[PDB]
């Protein structure tokens, strides 16, 4: 249930919250900016303004419901959380985000981290290109 | 030339814009947060407020003069834009940024994008750790 998920994240149930979460769960909205999410809601006949979308996505960010990624100069995109680690390949023209998890890259990071006297705790990797 | 760089960026040549550009051009301030850059200007006895630093840095970013990196925990580090490839190892404790480049990672990245028919335009790689 979508009520339970909200309540279980310490977040009071409200209608904007439900409607924005609903959208976040749609297969094709797996990676999404506040603007795109707002536009979807418009197409869905809703009146939720973009400021609410932002306010809600922030609350979801802090509650651990979503993860915020800051893309190349400007764009924040959101996705629902998972323990399953991935990195991102981003098309600069199609608004398309491919997830990947390469073993060799994962391993190399650990060794570079250790080449310098750095204890690796987290990373982020974004590849951008034309599709 | 700084006056020229600003004009080429379509930006009015002002004193605040000059001084912040000068700090960014200093070797030991290559990767710098707005707060660090502000503090540095105070140490030079300049009269530029923290707000002005934020605003100008944003104009620079919009204008392609600087590149912004969002690091773990929601802080922005700035550097002057370059084509000179390097990636980032970031000490969460020290607040230092170590540059690195790794042939294997760079090769794997090319193979991954090719596999999804993306022509890479650029990429960011931030490794976070304790130092
Ligand atoms: Zn990864
Ligand atoms: Zn993702
Ligand atoms: Zn850099
Ligand atoms: Zn690289």
Coordinates of C-alpha atoms and ligand atoms in Angstrom, one line a residue:
Chain A
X1 CA 0.0 0.0 0.0
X2 CA 1.1 3.6 -0.8
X3 CA -0.3 4.8 2.5
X4 CA 1.9 2.4 4.4
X5 CA 5.1 3.4 2.6
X6 CA 4.5 7.1 3.4
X7 CA 3.7 6.4 7.1
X8 CA 6.6 3.9 7.4
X9 CA 9.0 6.7 6.2
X10 CA 7.8 9.0 9.1
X11 CA 5.8 11.0 6.6
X12 CA 2.2 12.0 7.2
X13 CA -0.2 10.9 4.4
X14 CA -1.4 13.8 2.1
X15 CA -2.8 13.8 -1.4
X16 CA 0.1 15.5 -3.3
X17 CA 2.4 13.1 -1.6
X18 CA 0.3 10.1 -2.8
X19 CA 0.0 11.4 -6.3
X20 CA 3.7 12.2 -6.7
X21 CA 4.6 8.8 -5.3
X22 CA 2.2 7.1 -7.7
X23 CA 4.1 8.8 -10.5
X24 CA 7.5 7.8 -9.2
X25 CA 6.4 4.2 -9.3
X26 CA 5.5 4.2 -13.1
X27 CA 8.0 2.0 -15.0
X28 CA 9.0 4.8 -17.4
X29 CA 9.5 7.4 -14.6
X30 CA 12.3 5.5 -13.0
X31 CA 14.6 8.5 -13.3
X32 CA 12.9 11.9 -13.3
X33 CA 13.4 15.6 -12.7
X34 CA 11.0 17.7 -10.7
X35 CA 10.0 19.4 -14.0
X36 CA 9.3 16.2 -15.9
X37 CA 7.4 15.0 -12.9
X38 CA 5.4 18.2 -12.8
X39 CA 4.6 17.9 -16.5
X40 CA 3.4 14.3 -16.1
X41 CA 1.0 15.5 -13.4
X42 CA -0.3 18.2 -15.7
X43 CA -1.0 15.5 -18.4
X44 CA -2.7 13.5 -15.7
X45 CA -5.2 16.3 -15.1
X46 CA -3.7 17.4 -11.7
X47 CA -3.1 21.0 -10.5
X48 CA -0.1 20.4 -8.3
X49 CA 2.4 23.2 -9.0
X50 CA 6.1 22.7 -9.5
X51 CA 7.0 24.2 -6.1
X52 CA 4.9 21.5 -4.4
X53 CA 6.7 18.9 -6.5
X54 CA 10.0 20.2 -5.3
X55 CA 8.8 20.5 -1.6
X56 CA 7.6 16.8 -1.8
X57 CA 10.6 15.4 -3.5
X58 CA 12.9 17.1 -0.9
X59 CA 10.8 15.5 1.9
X60 CA 11.0 12.2 0.1
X61 CA 14.8 12.7 -0.2
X62 CA 15.3 13.2 3.6
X63 CA 12.8 10.4 4.4
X64 CA 14.8 8.0 2.3
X65 CA 12.0 7.4 -0.2
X66 CA 14.0 8.9 -3.1
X67 CA 17.6 9.6 -4.0
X68 CA 18.6 12.9 -5.6
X69 CA 21.2 12.9 -8.4
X70 CA 22.7 16.2 -9.7
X71 CA 23.3 15.8 -13.4
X72 CA 25.6 17.8 -15.8
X73 CA 25.1 21.5 -15.0
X74 CA 21.6 22.1 -13.6
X75 CA 19.3 19.0 -13.7
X76 CA 18.4 17.1 -10.5
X77 CA 16.8 13.8 -11.3
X78 CA 15.1 11.6 -8.7
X79 CA 14.4 7.8 -8.4
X80 CA 13.0 5.5 -5.7
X81 CA 15.7 4.1 -3.4
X82 CA 17.2 0.6 -3.7
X83 CA 20.1 -1.2 -2.0
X84 CA 21.1 -2.4 -5.6
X85 CA 23.9 -0.1 -6.6
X86 CA 24.1 1.3 -10.1
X87 CA 25.8 4.1 -12.1
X88 CA 24.4 6.2 -14.9
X89 CA 24.8 6.7 -18.6
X90 CA 22.9 9.7 -19.8
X91 CA 21.7 10.7 -23.3
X92 CA 22.1 14.4 -23.8
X93 CA 19.3 14.5 -26.4
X94 CA 16.7 11.8 -25.6
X95 CA 16.2 12.3 -21.9
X96 CA 17.2 8.6 -21.5
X97 CA 19.1 7.2 -18.5
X98 CA 20.7 3.8 -18.7
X99 CA 21.8 2.1 -15.4
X100 CA 24.9 0.0 -15.4
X101 CA 27.2 -1.8 -12.9
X102 CA 30.6 -2.7 -14.3
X103 CA 32.8 -5.1 -12.2
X104 CA 36.1 -3.9 -13.6
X105 CA 35.2 -0.2 -12.9
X106 CA 34.0 -1.1 -9.4
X107 CA 37.3 -2.9 -8.7
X108 CA 39.5 -0.2 -10.2
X109 CA 37.9 2.5 -7.9
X110 CA 39.0 0.4 -4.8
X111 CA 42.6 0.2 -6.1
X112 CA 42.9 3.9 -7.0
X113 CA 41.3 4.7 -3.6
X114 CA 44.1 2.6 -2.0
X115 CA 46.8 3.9 -4.4
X116 CA 46.3 7.2 -2.5
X117 CA 45.8 6.7 1.2
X118 CA 42.0 6.9 0.9
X119 CA 39.5 4.6 2.5
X120 CA 36.6 4.4 0.0
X121 CA 33.1 4.9 1.4
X122 CA 31.1 5.9 -1.6
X123 CA 31.3 7.0 -5.2
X124 CA 29.2 8.5 -8.1
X125 CA 29.7 8.0 -11.8
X126 CA 27.9 9.7 -14.6
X127 CA 28.6 9.2 -18.3
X128 CA 27.1 11.7 -20.7
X129 CA 26.7 11.2 -24.5
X130 CA 24.6 11.7 -27.7
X131 CA 21.9 9.1 -28.6
Chain B
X1 CA 42.8 38.1 -20.6
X2 CA 40.1 38.3 -17.9
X3 CA 38.3 41.4 -19.2
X4 CA 38.1 39.6 -22.5
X5 CA 37.0 36.2 -21.1
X6 CA 34.1 37.9 -19.3
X7 CA 33.1 39.8 -22.5
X8 CA 33.4 36.5 -24.5
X9 CA 31.0 35.0 -21.9
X10 CA 28.5 37.9 -22.5
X11 CA 29.1 39.2 -19.0
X12 CA 29.6 42.8 -17.9
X13 CA 33.2 43.5 -16.7
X14 CA 32.8 44.3 -13.0
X15 CA 35.3 44.4 -10.0
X16 CA 33.6 41.5 -8.1
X17 CA 33.6 39.3 -11.3
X18 CA 37.3 40.1 -11.8
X19 CA 38.5 39.2 -8.3
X20 CA 36.6 35.9 -8.0
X21 CA 38.1 35.0 -11.4
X22 CA 41.5 35.8 -10.1
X23 CA 41.1 33.5 -7.1
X24 CA 39.9 30.7 -9.3
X25 CA 43.0 31.2 -11.5
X26 CA 45.3 30.6 -8.5
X27 CA 47.0 27.1 -8.4
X28 CA 46.1 26.5 -4.7
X29 CA 42.4 27.3 -5.3
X30 CA 41.8 25.1 -8.3
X31 CA 39.0 23.1 -6.6
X32 CA 37.2 25.6 -4.4
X33 CA 33.8 25.9 -2.7
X34 CA 32.0 29.3 -2.6
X35 CA 32.7 29.5 1.2
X36 CA 36.4 28.8 0.7
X37 CA 36.5 31.4 -2.1
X38 CA 34.8 34.0 0.0
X39 CA 37.2 33.3 3.0
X40 CA 40.1 33.6 0.6
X41 CA 38.8 37.1 -0.6
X42 CA 38.4 38.2 3.0
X43 CA 42.0 37.2 3.6
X44 CA 43.1 39.4 0.7
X45 CA 41.2 42.2 2.5
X46 CA 38.5 42.4 -0.2
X47 CA 35.0 43.6 0.6
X48 CA 33.0 41.0 -1.3
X49 CA 30.1 39.4 0.6
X50 CA 29.3 35.7 0.6
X51 CA 26.1 36.4 -1.4
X52 CA 27.9 38.0 -4.2
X53 CA 30.2 35.0 -4.4
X54 CA 27.2 32.7 -4.7
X55 CA 25.6 34.9 -7.3
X56 CA 28.7 35.4 -9.5
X57 CA 29.7 31.8 -9.2
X58 CA 26.2 31.0 -10.7
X59 CA 26.6 33.4 -13.6
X60 CA 30.0 31.8 -14.3
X61 CA 28.4 28.4 -14.3
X62 CA 25.6 29.5 -16.6
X63 CA 28.2 31.1 -18.8
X64 CA 30.5 28.1 -18.9
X65 CA 33.4 29.9 -17.2
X66 CA 33.3 27.5 -14.2
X67 CA 32.2 23.8 -13.7
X68 CA 30.3 22.9 -10.5
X69 CA 30.7 19.6 -8.7
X70 CA 28.0 18.4 -6.3
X71 CA 29.8 16.3 -3.7
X72 CA 28.4 13.8 -1.1
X73 CA 26.4 15.8 1.5
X74 CA 25.2 18.6 -0.7
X75 CA 28.3 20.9 -1.1
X76 CA 29.4 22.5 -4.4
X77 CA 33.1 22.7 -5.4
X78 CA 34.0 25.0 -8.3
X79 CA 36.8 25.0 -10.8
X80 CA 37.5 26.9 -14.1
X81 CA 36.2 24.9 -17.1
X82 CA 38.7 22.8 -19.0
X83 CA 39.0 20.1 -21.5
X84 CA 42.0 18.8 -19.5
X85 CA 40.7 15.4 -18.4
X86 CA 40.9 14.4 -14.7
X87 CA 38.7 12.7 -12.1
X88 CA 38.2 13.2 -8.4
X89 CA 39.0 11.6 -5.1
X90 CA 37.4 13.5 -2.3
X91 CA 38.3 13.4 1.4
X92 CA 35.1 13.9 3.4
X93 CA 37.3 14.8 6.4
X94 CA 40.3 16.8 5.0
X95 CA 38.3 18.7 2.4
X96 CA 41.0 18.0 -0.2
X97 CA 40.4 16.9 -3.8
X98 CA 43.0 14.6 -5.3
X99 CA 43.1 14.3 -9.1
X100 CA 43.5 11.0 -10.8
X101 CA 43.2 9.4 -14.3
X102 CA 43.0 5.6 -14.8
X103 CA 43.5 4.0 -18.2
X104 CA 41.4 0.9 -17.4
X105 CA 38.4 2.9 -16.1
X106 CA 38.6 5.2 -19.1
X107 CA 38.7 2.2 -21.4
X108 CA 35.8 0.3 -19.7
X109 CA 33.7 3.5 -19.9
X110 CA 34.2 3.7 -23.7
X111 CA 33.2 0.0 -24.0
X112 CA 30.0 0.4 -21.9
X113 CA 28.7 3.4 -24.0
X114 CA 29.5 1.7 -27.2
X115 CA 27.4 -1.3 -25.9
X116 CA 24.4 1.1 -25.6
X117 CA 25.2 3.1 -28.8
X118 CA 26.1 6.3 -26.9
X119 CA 28.9 8.6 -28.2
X120 CA 30.4 9.8 -24.9
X121 CA 30.7 13.6 -24.8
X122 CA 32.0 13.8 -21.1
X123 CA 31.8 12.2 -17.7
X124 CA 32.3 12.8 -14.0
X125 CA 33.8 10.3 -11.5
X126 CA 33.8 11.3 -7.8
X127 CA 35.3 8.8 -5.4
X128 CA 34.5 9.7 -1.8
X129 CA 36.5 8.6 1.2
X130 CA 38.2 9.1 4.6
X131 CA 41.7 10.5 4.8
Ligands
LIG1 ZN1 29.4 2.2 -9.4
LIG2 ZN1 19.5 5.4 -10.9
LIG3 ZN1 38.3 19.0 -11.2
LIG4 ZN1 37.7 10.0 -16.4

